[PDB]
Amino acid sequence: MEIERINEHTVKFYMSYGDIEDRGFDREEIWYNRERSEELFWEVMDEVHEEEEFAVEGPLWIQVQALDKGLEIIVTKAQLSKDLDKLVPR
Template identity: 70%
Template sequence: MEIERINDNTVKFYISYLDVEERGFSRDEIWFNRDKSEELFWEMMDEVNEEADFAMEGPLWIQVQAMDKGLEVTVTRAQLTKDGQKIDMPDDIEERRKMFSGEDTGVHEFDEFDPVFNDPDPKTFEYTFILSEVEELLPIAERLKYVPVETSLHHFEGKYYLYAKFDEILHSDEDVKNHVSVISEYLKTSPLTIHRLEEYGKEIFKQDALSNILHYFG
């Protein structure tokens, strides 16, 4: 895979269909199977992060061009205002959920961008955080021990991942922002979804991860 760092907020990479197949995906899967296309995308983004030092923080804008022999993908971190609001994004961004689409021949440019990184769905707010040692969760668990949040802990490819899910019935937007800010003081967010962690990772705590951390390590 060829990677080009455009600027501080934009990176472009090219992957051939041969490379796609060597990674265990078929052309049909990346065009017509959303789960597989997202799995491939995040696998590529992990590689981009390692080689180009492109931290995946905040919502991402994604543009895909289907070339004759592969895919050219441009990823831009959305600009945020001081209060955390996205700017320079289409008004109906929440309805634009397409990451890959189109035919597998010719060149296609897409103006639809998907805020695929940690953007909450209409009913729940879900986040994934990466850490190296379980003990890193202790100060978070202590500060959020009275907060009703669904958490689980997973191990995947040498790292630990904390999954946190907030319910909009119990939490306002401001509550979620404050709680996530607490976690973000100690951990970085990760693009890995809970589905990938459950399928490929090792489950440490299926539920009440923060409470269990306090019980066993506090």
């Protein structure tokens, strides 16, 4: 597979259909199950886990698009807006 580090909170990766097949998932089964989707995300959090241990204090968030023989998947985290309450409309 193919990985990117946008910043500390957003990551994305690109997953060819054969990377999904290798793991014994299916491009369709990933989306059409729900618990079996999570395993994809665990596989990429794993690729970062020695740093995710500093930031495992909120949920995962996922977005995707499909491409000719694979998908790009973005993953995001709430820590991106842990600071928020200090902002005011003044």
